[PDB]
Symmetry: C3
């Protein structure tokens, strides 16, 4: 960041320094030039403005993740910007500044080429960091090692660590939140021929969950009917309608193992939120009936600063068919399996929309 | 649009005017130049062609939405194009046109710098309007205020109104279609200790929906068996097989509260569509068994021109953690809650794929 | 590819040839020039480096699909690169090479304009091939003609064949894998008034599937408890724990019609995979309990080289509202229906967050 910000500042200041050093250090010795110089000054002004606006739009933002190894392409871009600026300064010093270049059109064109090169480096930074991974090259199966919640994704050419950050950005809203509260063949044959206890326990659990869900739906409908939109603030109204639903809410959160996700304070805040935004009882209960993804919950359950990238291959090398890597937290892990999206061979077949003719039997 | 199209036309015509005014108004007074002029003419030709092709590809398309406030970045881009063109014209007039610039190489280089600056403005327009929001910065919980249908999305740096249009583009194919047809603690305790009427009503409704679904599946299988692919048109065949399924279809649409979504005319059109495209009875019933999203239905149920953006913050300012805003229609509303995607700190751990060694017990 | 690679190589070599032919064929006749030449050499060096890096990042990759007709925009780009290079060579030959141009600054500026034009052609290639379809213009309903598995997508301005490849890239991880093993009004009335055989058969099938699923969950829990992480390799451990679950796995794959998807060898490989990556019994069974998408399976079931694009309209023309086309394989087909994303008219409404005041009754 500090090095990157310094490189950006020096890159933006370099054309202006190139254009100001001759008119300041040697103005009389400098050879006067016509209108091409001023036209190039205007072009430099607008191209520096374009460069600053684009840099703000894409690159004046905080790093979104702390990668385990160096950001390979962004390091290459910093090196390229640095080599460009340093080489331009070297040449400028040794052949313009030292020689006290009388031809000012040459210096102005050198600064113009610098600004063009910086806009092209910005374009290259966009191509490397944003566009190389638009075309989906690979499909990733991401599975939690505990409950098997699986999603498949398409991803372009990213390094394994950038792919890891990408999958983490997807995880906090795609998978449900992690709820930890949720001879040999002869032994298998003896088990299979026993009472199917798990089947009936699962059926009973689903039945009691449906019963508690019904109780909760009725309780929340009654609770929201206990107030009118129209004196009383939305917080006071949430607190007044929470009493007629606190027991059913608590019992449903207990039967579905959702106690630590939803405190009384968070449920009151969400009641206030809903009744403020005209949300019906069902738009209130959508948060509590289903498991819901990780970002939906409190920030102390995210623990985004505690991801470990376990990769058999070095993480700076991009994906290829078969790369498996783990994203481990303290409790679960995300197993990511890579499969290259297969080569497609489309053929074109033409059918006449009038050629569809049908008959009675079968 | 009109102002934007005028700016685009003037920007494309400005280099050509710069290159044609000297050879027309003062050709004898103009100083002849060598081959660099013609090389720059060829470069201007190909760069104007590139500019026109890119403008067609991205910016010669109709506005996709009517935002409540000004499009901030596109207004900035129009202002930038206008300032660039107007300043180039001012300088050209006062130092080339008025002075009758004899050096034609300078004028050609000025036009070249203009074309470069327009290509760079096009690049900046792409960066501002398309690329600033590629990197997912925020996660949006979008919930219908009526039935609680919720989806989470990742979105980059967009203003709240552009985020609203984005969420609307997502809504018509993500959420199911809106079907409107679908002391105090002592009172809550008395209710919870009563007959769980909602549970048994829900079970009975699901049972009768499954029964009507089974009747409909059988009816549609029989109906499609009542015709063969092979005289009779697909429309006549749809009308001939609709009789053997009209009652079951109507009864299933009534039990699932889907009467106004599917008219006899639309069902006949979809029968014709399916039997034209070799779609099986199940590929036919996929439209009718599930609720389905909004765009699947008739255009009079979209009402895309009737969205209201209710935001506590001004809608030209981009998203930040905690921005809640409503997208209200006549009936329901989309509550959108923003949460910044958290900062990730990946660590790298290496495991030896050969180091996995297991033992018998537990 | 061969023509494209040749065009790329010639385009990269053309500036260097332009800069080397005068200093080699006529060095004495060549007019010496100052430092502007060397500054432009450095700019050419860094801009050719930028061009090569961007071309590698985006365009040095194998074609991802075999389209039925010509890639219209990529053909336009090849034609544009070719016309640019050929016209630059024509002018260079006839006015620099033949005339033995003494002014070397002109030749260097011509090469600089060439490199700028190639970077701008690269930018135009990005705009045409990657950016024109970022803005979602259309919504596509993709439905399998057999089981009606449907997904809606947003897609920008792509041709119908590029849209087809896009939908295929989505299909192998979005839809479940294709499992083929899964007067007239008076006749309809007689059928509807008969025993609802399909309802009870469906209920019985779901019940026995739940029973086999419970047996399989218990069997896999026991199997994974039959080993400890800690001598025995993960393959030997998978083979040792497969015996206590092989029967339940086979019976569940038979009741859900999943025999050909999962061989004993693939199940052993996946057991080894899971027990290697600390995946619990449920993270193991996530692959077998649900249908799962196509890419999850063996590569002989993908058959990506056997897609047929059946389109009523020519496939080189982009999408518009109402374009329906088929993606046919040997067994099923993907019906794709296009609907233009509707024009949105947002309005802004302001509500005071303090103005929310509620009252007791109803």
């Amino acid at each position: 960041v500090a090095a990157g910000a310094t490189l950006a500042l020096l890159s933006f200041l370099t054309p202006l320094a190139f254009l100001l050093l001759p008119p300041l250090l040697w103005r009389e010795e400098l050879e006067p030039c016509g209108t091409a110089c001023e036209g190039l000054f205007i072009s430099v002004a607008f191209k520096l403005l374009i460069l600053l606006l684009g840099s703000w739009a894409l690159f004046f933002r905080r790093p979104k993740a702390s990668l385990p190894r160096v950001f390979v392409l962004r390091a290459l871009l910093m090196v390229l910007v640095f080599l460009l600026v340093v080489s331009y300064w070297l040449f400028y010093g040794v052949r313009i500044l030292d020689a006290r270049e009388r031809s000012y059109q040459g210096v102005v064109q050198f600064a113009v080429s610098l600004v063009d090169a910086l806009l092209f480096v910005h374009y290259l930074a966009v191509v490397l960091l944003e566009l190389r991974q638009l075309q989906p090259q690979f499909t990733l199966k991401v599975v939690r090692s505990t409950d098997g919640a699986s999603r498949f994704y398409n991803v372009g050419h990213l390094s394994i660590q950038r792919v890891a950050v990408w999958i983490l950005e997807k995880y906090y809203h795609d998978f449900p939140v992690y709820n930890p509260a949720l001879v040999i063949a002869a032994a298998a044959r003896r088990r299979d021929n026993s009472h199917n206890e798990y089947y009936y326990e699962e059926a009973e659990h689903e039945r009691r969950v449906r019963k508690r869900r019904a109780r909760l739906v009725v309780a929340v409908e009654e609770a929201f009917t206990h107030i009118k939109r129209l004196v009383m603030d939305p917080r006071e109204a949430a607190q007044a309608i929470f009493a007629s639903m606190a027991r059913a809410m608590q019992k449903y959160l207990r039967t579905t193992k959702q106690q630590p996700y939803h405190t009384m304070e968070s449920i009151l805040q969400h009641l206030e939120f809903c009744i403020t935004h005209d949300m019906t009882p069902k738009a209130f209960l959508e948060r509590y009936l289903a498991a819901g993804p990780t970002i939906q919950y409190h920030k102390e359950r995210w623990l985004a600063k505690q991801w470990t990238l376990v990769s058999e291959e070095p993480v700076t090398n991009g994906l290829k068919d078969g790369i498996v890597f783990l994203l481990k937290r303290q409790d679960f892990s995300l197993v990511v399996s890579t499969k290259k999206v297969p080569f497609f061979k489309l053929s074109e077949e033409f059918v006449d929309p009038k050629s569809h003719k049908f008959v009675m039997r079968l």
